[PDB]
Design a protein around this nucleic acid. Structure first.
Ligand SMILES: [Mg+2]
Ligand SMILES: [Mg+2]
Ligand SMILES: [Mg+2]
Lengths: 97, 147, 205
RNA sequence: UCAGUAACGGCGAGUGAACAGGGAAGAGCCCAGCGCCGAAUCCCCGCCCCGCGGGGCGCGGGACAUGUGGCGUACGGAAGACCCGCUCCCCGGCGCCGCUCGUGGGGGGCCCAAGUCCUUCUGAUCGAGGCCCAGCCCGUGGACGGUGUGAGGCCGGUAGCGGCCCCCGGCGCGCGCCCGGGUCUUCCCGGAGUCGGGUUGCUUGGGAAUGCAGCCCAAAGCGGGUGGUAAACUCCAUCU
RNA sequence: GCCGUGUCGGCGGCCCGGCGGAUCUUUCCCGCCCCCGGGGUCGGCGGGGGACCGUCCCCCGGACCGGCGACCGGCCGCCGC
RNA sequence: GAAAGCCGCCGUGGCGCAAUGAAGGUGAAGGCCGGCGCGCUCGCCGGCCGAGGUGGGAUCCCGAGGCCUCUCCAGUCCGCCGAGGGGCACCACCGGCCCGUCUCGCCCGCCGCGCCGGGGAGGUGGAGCACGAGCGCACGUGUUAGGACCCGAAAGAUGGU
RNA sequence: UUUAAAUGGGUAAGAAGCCCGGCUCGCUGGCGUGGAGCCGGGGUGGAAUGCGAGUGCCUAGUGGGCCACUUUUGGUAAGC
RNA sequence: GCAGAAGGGCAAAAGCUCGCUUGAUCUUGAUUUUCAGUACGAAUACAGACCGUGAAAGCGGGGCCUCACGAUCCUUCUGA
């Protein structure tokens, strides 16, 4: 009993299954590229804000750490993603020892 | 036609139809809608009541395609098909009612308007009003909905 | 400046507009300049069809226009994939290609594949010197005309169905009513609120 | 067309887009990266194959360049190995023949018919007249100059008129170049002081900031951008 | 000899007749979907076909007027030669 | 001939055919007849129909009676006709319907029984409905924006000598 | 200010009026009360004089005024 | 005397004293005054709630009446 407004809207067609367009698989990690970024962050090191961040992230607290990452790296969706990969260095520094 | 107008008939007369005293100059009341609250106030009420102020909600970027629904009410409903249909509909065989879908005639909603005739229909619209669909269910017709 | 009962108006002439004026005096002169650019483009090419390649069946967007059928841009590689022709071969067969187009319905997919194979079955090629792969004898006896007019396979042909006559039965005259519009519209907006109160009785214990 | 609409505005005066939709026209591609090929690449100089109106593929020396020339590759995916069924191509240059839709272009010089009889006048192109063949020509009754108002006296104008001179785009002998497609298997797969954030300016219809710019801070990699009300959570769509 | 308008008929010309219809026909003809090499109208799809209705093209009869649409005959009264 | 002609599966679109609300949105037909439920201040089924009613209302219709060279018998006509009738447009009034809000209230519905849908009765707000009148073109008057009926400053700005 | 003119101002001088019969009401309420409304019926000559009215749209000019009787304010008065 | 500037009004009162109270509340229209016959302000007659007072009829939705005040834009609070 198909109708235009409501919760099952629209004229009913059947979906075309298709392998997705190749542009959409663009920011994947592609293991050789994982090797280049993981090798080069130990020949080069950490930024001065993310050394101060991981010396708040081991002792001080975490709500104040992300409040420090909120201001410098831009948004909130970027500040958590930075805060969790500094914590995965801090976990690999201490708990892998 | 420069011949048929007031300025040929008014040539010879000194102030050219504007007066010795008032002596029409350029802009004695201001340009445009100047002074609409101050010295042209009595013009803007008594002829444009409502002209000053906020009155509703702002809607940024409306699209005049989301709100598009044309309407046909029930007197204009039998002209969407031929007159050869309805004369063939009622000549006493069975309850065979024709379709009338307003969507391939370019209408989306069916509103109410009295004197829908005695024949049954099946009417395929996107929307209906409740006055409209109970005129249809009282002539023995049906009301089928489409997306 | 205003007077008796009139219109309050905004002529947008408060800007120096007599320099930016556009008069269409060359407009008959440009209509016979782009007829002669169509005639000397028709006779210049070939017996290849005038007004260019074959366009697909395409449905318009946006609620107001989604009941009509429009001529599109190309042929959306999936439709070229099913029909069996190659993507770089196709545009010298006379077939337009739009690679950024998506097919997510199946009926509108199979419509243009039917269109594209109907084109290939009414096409005659010319070998340079008469080798003719995928091609045989005399060119459909000189192809019955020379060149077509404003669409090779009549690009719109927006068609409607018959739906001849039915009998007003039970379960059809009785249910699908205005109450079904009002209740379905209300459940569309009371869906997220009612799924929130259900969580609140799920954390009730 | 949307539309003087959404929107902006001492919300005053005023300003003010876009998306669908109908048309005109329609055409698509390349690279860095990531890998592969013994730098397989390019420039200059010298004498020649052999040439007109001069540019080369051939030969020998100097450089460029591994801090990366070239080939195959570009997100619509790609490459390689398989397997499967086809196929021998395209490009310019040379000589000449055959055309060219208004009937290719440029240039010069040519092409119908009263100066008849009477008459007015400074002078006629005036006015009258030409048998029952309609006085003559007309695919030529545009125009202008000629002692005044001219189809026929004179340039011309008409006509896929004719002949002349030069020039152009395209068939066919010799150079130059030449394995594509499908199916499966594995590997590969991307642009940073940029995005973004804060703040300050200018701009916009863009309004809790449309765009731009300065300064400061400054990324990620199931990432990033956008989804027209700031923010958090969540799902989806879409692009790269 | 004549055409105007309702009434038809010969369904004649409809298959060697025009167009129009969101009339009908799931037995016609073409490439396909729904189940167990075949098959079920088993519901249709894209197209062609041929019935029906609406209006316009002839033939016989019939209706009125023969209307600025007309010729011949006879009549009356003019007319020039 | 920069004309004219045509298209129509070139009508997309414009304006009109529907209004109202800030919006979500909703969205203009009634009366009678015959019966029934506490014919309960409320209503229900079926038919007949169909833009309601009142007061005015051009025109039209009917019209006793009236009007003719001798009287009783019959015809067309025309003029005069008190009165009566159906009443155009339009005006005033009353009722009705649709949308926004208000008050008072009871009942019904189920792609799912709910901080769910629909209905009622009264009152008010609307640029509404109540058998469509618009569109295109042309002309005239009026108002406006433009140099704006003509002429007229003291100024201000930009770039130069 | 008890009293109180002349001139002046309003209304009325019929058919939309008058009378009678009936019926709706959820208003009013001893009451077939009261009041509104609706329907139907009955009788038109209702002061003088003059005159054709009713109605809508569009609309220019004007927005410095001045004088004289009579009535009055300021001023000694004024072509104030 | 009635708060006050005047005028009008007022006697088992509209004054004076006392007793309860919050109608100086909630809501829709109509009307008058100024007037263009617009607005604000002020006022009047209702209607619908909810109340107060009184034995009750009634009276009351500010002051015995004539004056005592204020748009759009913006801010703020309140309401479902
Ligand atoms: Mg004037
Ligand atoms: Mg200056
Ligand atoms: Mg004037």
């Amino acid at each position: 009993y198909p109708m235009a407004v409501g919760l099952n809207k629209g004229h009913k067609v059947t979906k075309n299954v298709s392998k997705p367009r190749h542009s959409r698989r663009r920011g994947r990690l592609t293991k050789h590229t994982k090797f280049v970024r993981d090798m080069i962050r130990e020949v080069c090191g950490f930024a001065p804000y993310e050394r101060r961040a991981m010396e708040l992230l081991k002792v001080s607290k975490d709500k104040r750490a992300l409040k420090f990452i909120k201001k410098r790296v831009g948004t909130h969706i970027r500040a958590k993603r930075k805060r969790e990969e500094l914590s995965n260095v801090l976990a690999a520094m201490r708990k892998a020892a | 036609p420069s011949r048929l107008r007031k300025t040929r008939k008014l040539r010879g007369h000194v102030s050219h139809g504007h007066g010795r005293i008032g002596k029409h100059r350029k802009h004695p009341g201001g340009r445009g809608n100047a002074g609409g609250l101050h010295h042209h106030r009595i013009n803007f009420d008594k002829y444009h009541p409502g002209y000053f102020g906020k009155v509703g909600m702002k809607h940024y970027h409306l699209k005049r395609n989301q709100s598009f629904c044309p309407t046909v009410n029930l007197d204009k409903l039998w002209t969407l098909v031929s007159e050869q249909t309805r004369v063939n509909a009622a000549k006493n065989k069975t309850g065979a009612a024709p379709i009338i879908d307003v969507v391939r005639s370019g209408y989306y909603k069916v509103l109410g308007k009295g004197k829908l005739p005695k024949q049954p229909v099946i009417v395929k619209a996107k929307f209906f009003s409740r006055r409209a669909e109970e005129k249809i269910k009282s002539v023995g017709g049906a009301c089928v909905l489409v997306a | 400046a205003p007077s008796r009962n009139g219109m309050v108006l905004k002529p947008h002439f408060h800007k120096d507009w007599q320099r930016r004026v556009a008069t269409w005096f060359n407009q008959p002169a440009r209509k016979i300049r782009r007829r002669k650019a169509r005639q000397a483009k028709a006779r210049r090419i070939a017996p290849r069809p005038a007004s260019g390649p074959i366009r697909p069946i395409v449905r318009c967007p946006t609620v107001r226009y989604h009941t009509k059928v429009r001529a599109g841009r190309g042929f959306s590689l999936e439709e070229l994939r099913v029909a069996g022709i190659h993507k770089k071969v196709a545009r010298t067969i006379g077939i337009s290609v739009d690679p950024r187009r998506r097919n997510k319905s199946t009926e509108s997919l199979q419509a243009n594949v039917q269109r594209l194979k109907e084109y290939r079955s009414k096409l005659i090629l010319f070998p340079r010197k008469p080798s003719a792969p995928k091609k045989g004898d005399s060119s459909a006896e000189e192809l019955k005309l020379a060149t077509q007019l404003t669409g090779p396979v009549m690009p719109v042909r927006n068609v409607y169905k018959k739906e001849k006559a039915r009998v007003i039965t039970e379960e059809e005259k009785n249910f699908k009513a205005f109450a079904s519009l009002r209740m379905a519209r209300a459940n569309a907006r009371l869906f997220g609120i009612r799924a929130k109160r259900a969580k609140e009785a799920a954390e009730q214990d």
